[PDB]
Amino acid sequence: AERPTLPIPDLLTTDARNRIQLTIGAGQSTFGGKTATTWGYNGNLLGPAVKLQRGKAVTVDIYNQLTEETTLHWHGLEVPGEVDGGPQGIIPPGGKRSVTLNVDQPAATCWFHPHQHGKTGRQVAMGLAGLVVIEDDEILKLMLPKQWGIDDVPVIVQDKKFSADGQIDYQLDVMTAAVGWFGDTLLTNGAIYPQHAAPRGWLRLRLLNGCNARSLNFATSDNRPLYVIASDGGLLPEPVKVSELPVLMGERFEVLVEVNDNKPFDLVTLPVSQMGMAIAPFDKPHPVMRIQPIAISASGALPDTLSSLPALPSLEGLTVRKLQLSMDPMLDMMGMQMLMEKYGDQAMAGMDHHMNHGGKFDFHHANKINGQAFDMNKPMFAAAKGQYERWVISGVGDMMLHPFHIHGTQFRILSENGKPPAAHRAGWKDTVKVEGNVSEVLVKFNHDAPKEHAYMAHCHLLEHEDTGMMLGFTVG
Numbered sequence: 001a002e003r004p005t006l007p008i009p010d011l012l013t014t015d016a017r018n019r020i021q022l023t024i025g026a027g028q029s030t031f032g033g034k035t036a037t038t039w040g041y042n043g044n045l046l047g048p049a050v051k052l053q054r055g056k057a058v059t060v061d062i063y064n065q066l067t068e069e070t071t072l073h074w075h076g077l078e079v080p081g082e083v084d085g086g087p088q089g090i091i092p093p094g095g096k097r098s099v100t101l102n103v104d105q106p107a108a109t110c111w112f113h114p115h116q117h118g119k120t121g122r123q124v125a126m127g128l129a130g131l132v133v134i135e136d137d138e139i140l141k142l143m144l145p146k147q148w149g150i151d152d153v154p155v156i157v158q159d160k161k162f163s164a165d166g167q168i169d170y171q172l173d174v175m176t177a178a179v180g181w182f183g184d185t186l187l188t189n190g191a192i193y194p195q196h197a198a199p200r201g202w203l204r205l206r207l208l209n210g211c212n213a214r215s216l217n218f219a220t221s222d223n224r225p226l227y228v229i230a231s232d233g234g235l236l237p238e239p240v241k242v243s244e245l246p247v248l249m250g251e252r253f254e255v256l257v258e259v260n261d262n263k264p265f266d267l268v269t270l271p272v273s274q275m276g277m278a279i280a281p282f283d284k285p286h287p288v289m290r291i292q293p294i295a296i297s298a299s300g301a302l303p304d305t306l307s308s309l310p311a312l313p314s315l316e317g318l319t320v321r322k323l324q325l326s327m328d329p330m331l332d333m334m335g336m337q338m339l340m341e342k343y344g345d346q347a348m349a350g351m352d353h354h355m356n357h358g359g360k361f362d363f364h365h366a367n368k369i370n371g372q373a374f375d376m377n378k379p380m381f382a383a384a385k386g387q388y389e390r391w392v393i394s395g396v397g398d399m400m401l402h403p404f405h406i407h408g409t410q411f412r413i414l415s416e417n418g419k420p421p422a423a424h425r426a427g428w429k430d431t432v433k434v435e436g437n438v439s440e441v442l443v444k445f446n447h448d449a450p451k452e453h454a455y456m457a458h459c460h461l462l463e464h465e466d467t468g469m470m471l472g473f474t475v476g
């Protein structure tokens, strides 16, 4: 049969009352011809792309039609804690919450997803994610590919696994609390290996790793390059040509790729060196989507310069914050043992060369920052507003992958896991790799966050977050 076409999320803008309506609800999707219960925003699975403009405010009305509590976080948006939608931003089942977003950051592709305390991994795995497209005056002048769903297309890549009855098979248990929830089925905007028909010339892909725990590495099947034009928080100063593009959980990159008549090619993900993630079929390059060239000229440009990136400031005298990530050694060893027993040696491919003892030994609080599993009631510190700070995040002590995310900012990486950042990772980021080593970022918070609606900082391997690897912090 033919491949399904790549689903395109609707691009949503405000009404005359300056409102955007988002309904959270459960419905059915089909995977491989079997129905599954799934959750979506304004539909059964995934969500729309909310379009925002710098310097304009919009109001979002969020209707929770699930039968359990949820929250809605705008990953990558710099907004006050009161509207950030972290764990404290509860929307009761059957209820509504509205937030007004005063957008004040450069053009970028951001995204949104639940942040329910202890349950973020299940609620994302069940289907909830959407996109945010921020525009500003500067980016339109570049004349990039801009026809949504034609030569400018979002690519949300996620894995799932399913039980024999067809349902999503999600579990937060000792194994997934150590290495993450991952599956054997790759979805691209919710579809299995779709095709996208693109005009001749440049195709812009807005890539999101929406997996709970799987890192990805994008490339093309015939080795044509990808031109990175933007990271999590916006445009790079100029395009950066790459042959492959690692993307951690929750990160975005925008790339341009050439489309030539008569030569279809796949976007693929290459096997990664992360525990558990190279089990067949991910032990080999795995197609993400087929690009099918159409003999109609695409009008978008790849300019030589994209934007201006300010220099790093002097570092001397800046507040230095230490964030030590850690995993309980027993539950790390028990979860890795369960992974090895299940899949064998292949669960470490590509890597470098039973009784109840009480709540002190519960894996639900086994992962920690600065010795503490996340405590919703006690922000760990008060960060300055309007001031640059150097945050130092260490994963020394274990060898798991921690894509560390900080709410309320777009930062600059100074060191990524012990090395200067790659050029396409040197601009605006909201995630930094931490794996067995130390990273340092330069952050500044432009908005307030009080104790009652604190900002979060956490590993974005969702099963780590949900079992304690998160802290709250206030600003102002």
Ligand SMILES: [Cu+2]
Pocket (backbone or CB within 6 Å): 075, 113, 250, 460
């Ligand atoms: Cu996120």
Ligand SMILES: [Cu+2]
Pocket (backbone or CB within 6 Å): 073, 074, 075, 076, 405, 406, 407, 408
């Ligand atoms: Cu976030």
Ligand SMILES: [Cu+2]
Pocket (backbone or CB within 6 Å): 400, 401, 402, 403, 459, 460, 461, 464, 465, 469
């Ligand atoms: Cu982690």
Ligand SMILES: [Cu+2]
Pocket (backbone or CB within 6 Å): 073, 115, 405, 407, 456, 458
């Ligand atoms: Cu978060």
